[PDB]
Amino acid sequence: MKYMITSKGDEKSDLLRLNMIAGFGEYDMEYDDVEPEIVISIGGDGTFLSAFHQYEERLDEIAFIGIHTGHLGFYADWRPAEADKLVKLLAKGEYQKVSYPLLKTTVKYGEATYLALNESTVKSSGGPFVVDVVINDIHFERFRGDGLCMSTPSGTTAYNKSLGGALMHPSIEAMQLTEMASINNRVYRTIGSPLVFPKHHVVSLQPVNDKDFQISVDHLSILHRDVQEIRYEVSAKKIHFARFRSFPFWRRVHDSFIED
Amino acid sequence: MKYMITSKGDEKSDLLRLNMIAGFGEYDMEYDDVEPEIVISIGGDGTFLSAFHQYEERLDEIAFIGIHTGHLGFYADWRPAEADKLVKLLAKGEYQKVSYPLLKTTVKYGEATYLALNESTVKSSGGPFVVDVVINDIHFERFRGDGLCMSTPSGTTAYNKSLGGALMHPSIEAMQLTEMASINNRVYRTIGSPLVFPKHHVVSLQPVNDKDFQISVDHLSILHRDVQEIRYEVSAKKIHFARFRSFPFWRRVHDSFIED
Amino acid sequence: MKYMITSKGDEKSDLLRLNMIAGFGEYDMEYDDVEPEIVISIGGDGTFLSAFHQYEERLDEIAFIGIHTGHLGFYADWRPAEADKLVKLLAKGEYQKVSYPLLKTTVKYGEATYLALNESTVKSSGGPFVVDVVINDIHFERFRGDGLCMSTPSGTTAYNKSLGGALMHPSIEAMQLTEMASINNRVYRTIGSPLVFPKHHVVSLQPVNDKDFQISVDHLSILHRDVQEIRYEVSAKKIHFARFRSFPFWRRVHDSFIED
Amino acid sequence: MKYMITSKGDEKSDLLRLNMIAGFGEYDMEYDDVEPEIVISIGGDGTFLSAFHQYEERLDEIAFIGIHTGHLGFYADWRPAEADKLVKLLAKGEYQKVSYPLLKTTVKYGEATYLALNESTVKSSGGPFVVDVVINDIHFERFRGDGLCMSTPSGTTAYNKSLGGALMHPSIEAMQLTEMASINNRVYRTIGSPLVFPKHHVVSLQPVNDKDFQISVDHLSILHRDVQEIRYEVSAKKIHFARFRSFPFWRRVHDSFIED
Lengths: 260, 260, 260, 260
Ligand SMILES: [N-]=[N+]=NCCCCn1cnc2c(N)ncnc21
Ligand SMILES: [N-]=[N+]=NCCCCn1cnc2c(N)ncnc21
Ligand SMILES: [N-]=[N+]=NCCCCn1cnc2c(N)ncnc21
Ligand SMILES: [N-]=[N+]=NCCCCn1cnc2c(N)ncnc21
Fold this sequence. Notes:
Number of domains of chain A: 2
Strand content of chain A: 35-45%
Oligomer: homotetramer
Bound molecules: 9-(4-azidobutyl)purin-6-amine
Largest sheet of chain A: 6 strands, antiparallel
């Protein structure tokens, strides 16, 4: 059973990484960042996202685990001083795997798929943002504002939360769309409410004038030219976590936003 | 196969009801409001809610169908002039049944269960509303404001929508909690975001000073004294609709809030 | 120069009141709760509101001052341990007076005026809340929801803030109206945005079906039957504070909601 | 008394412009786009903003007037078919001038002032947006989100409205700040409520890491590097409108967002 460990690169996370590799050396555990089976993130949630995207082609073969050196994270939910007990149970242990749903983002020109852990956003490159929203091949609305954000269940606690979106429990295979500063007068009308779509529903964005958009998936932001369709749906692929303890999602929400 | 038809009582809905009973008389269809198998609502969504609560003890044995004489409703989605084609297919037809999730509300003193189609709300009888929120036996927050609203998937388009809640597709077995004018300063903290809970999750409300609350289930509002716990969870019971046509939930949302 | 002191009634505020009366006795300062010139509140903001409404017929003749025994308040902005220095400067001192705007609320039947320090709210007695909104004799909208709240500048930090309202600086003679869980579909339309009205603007509420409303002014809540019009405007009367120090309104907002 | 007329450039507005110049030729009215006294905008609100910024150095010497060829605008509030009656009263008439407040935006490096009619916004060039907010030389908060928007009274109906801001009547000399998708957890805290500042209050933005910002004034968007301070305050300069009729601001709000 192979493993690898990424670090935030600062003074604290690098020294915590070298002490776990030394601890993992007392066990016959091979370090392999090429085709690992246990990926360990040390730092914050952004480090976990980078660690996730580094191996998004082997999601079935990998069980993730995150350690937080700064604040408490939603994916990095392991205190740094608890690493020695983590190394012990992650070696000689069987534990159990927990899986979360993911978001597929398809872009067509005149196809490019993506996998997101938190959210995927769309904005305009310069001019005003105007798109028609199609839900299962039915025109629902014509949005105009700053943009739109489609979130995963676990990602509702991120950017989705800042846009008024609802926090969904990760056991629900769904995706949530939220609006960014839309225009609503007697002429232009958007729904306003966040929308939650189940598995096997397809939300499609279609341009109306400008065909250049600034699509961002998680932290990765990029620019697309002459875009024909942006296609959202819940991915069949799932991330796999490795849990040694009961840390409820609703408890992580509490400690992060209420008090801890 | 028995049937019954409730009416809004006005001049328009009563005459539409008598023309369907006459149409149903050409077929060997017995009218029975005691133990029917097909309940028909004529009027609005409020008439459908009353028709629902009139037979919430025979939900498996009943397939509902609603006709709207005023506006377009979410449960009453059949144009009045389409009643003759409805009577024809509802008699000699097999159609297909569609089921939505429901909400169970338990109240304990020193137990009383309820079934809601839209939402269940809690407020205080006079004084300020203060409750502790417990999620699966874990204290999540101490709310203080006007009250709280727990919504069903199909009920997100009602009161839940007015509170900033997200609109969920009815195929998702879940419930959504939304806040009513909460207080948030450096001392008192609520989450603010609407919360979506899956099946088999229990949200419990517990008093902090006053033990009298104005609990309302759908339209039925009542007052409870010396309350110990308000217990929410997704009911195992489901309502059964009878669909003769493709009318997507997202299309009903469009026609009701965008344009029609 | 006469004075009086009200108390929250608890063990802490009553003992703090008797130590100031003893301190005020070393000076030739007459205690008079009939026609005072300096009203002192000890406890919280609710105690200050009661102290305000106890003498709302002598607002020009009174300069208010509040002490907070619990949390920090917006009107009770004096630490309890700073009472001896307060008694000293309030006796032999000239200080300076600060004035805030107030809200006039007129109710007509088939007239009853009120003065509010924070806000005045309107709801329905049982049935749905439906009112037409008239602004300077021009029909602006037909509201339907839970109710409406009209706030004073200093009251924007209270109930107005919980309804999404903006926080106005008290030096602005204005009033702010905010909506309570309104209904908005393709048929019924409200503005949604909080509205800020200047001096000499009249916002009038007019019933549409039910003519019974639960009008509340600050903490005082009451019920009115067969109501014809609810009339809002900025009062010409102003409350008078007595400031010995620089405590900016924006600083009080910071300490109350950010950190202190 | 000189005059000039700008056009949207389309087929409809250009032909409406040439018919007014011909009408203004029957009167001894000199056309002068260098130093006019009456500026006329034909098209939309964006055309009025460009017409405003074309002469923001002669605001006292100019009384503006806008005609709308597309929708109804807030600054272009004159029906196209009413141009002949406009030309008549604008020539031989005295009318009356109406003045609105404006927003001053100062940027310092290691000064550049601006005048806005609607709003001024700040965002980050790439990285996360983090700024400290200083109000009259007092640190109020440390914002982190997408950005911030400071609005004028008449501009509250634009971008400010899309951010949850309140609509202020133009007779109030003030400015309103609204937040753009801020982050709020147990660590990072923003006020959330829109803030309304009176005349002679200074809101200052100060960077925390990145010193490059995408400042936008009305429609004009630009990029600033190595920024030290962004300084907001209500300008002493005021725009001057020329009104021939009673068109209340609250009525323009009604026709634009409710119905017309
Ligand atoms: N991109 N970036 N950097 C900002 C990272 C902010 C914290 N954060 C990242 N993911 C999150 C998540 N799923 N739930 C809650 N909080 C999260
Ligand atoms: N109680 N009551 N009367 C007011 C009824 C208002 C309309 N309405 C009722 N249920 C609804 C629902 N599920 N989705 C959308 N709209 C609904
Ligand atoms: N009614 N009551 N009790 C609840 C009192 C809550 C605190 N509070 C009262 N006035 C306030 C005000 N103007 N600004 C901020 N906070 C205020
Ligand atoms: N920049 N740009 N183009 C978009 C212009 C949108 C309409 N609009 C411009 N100013 C406005 C204002 N003060 N109140 C309301 N609506 C306004």
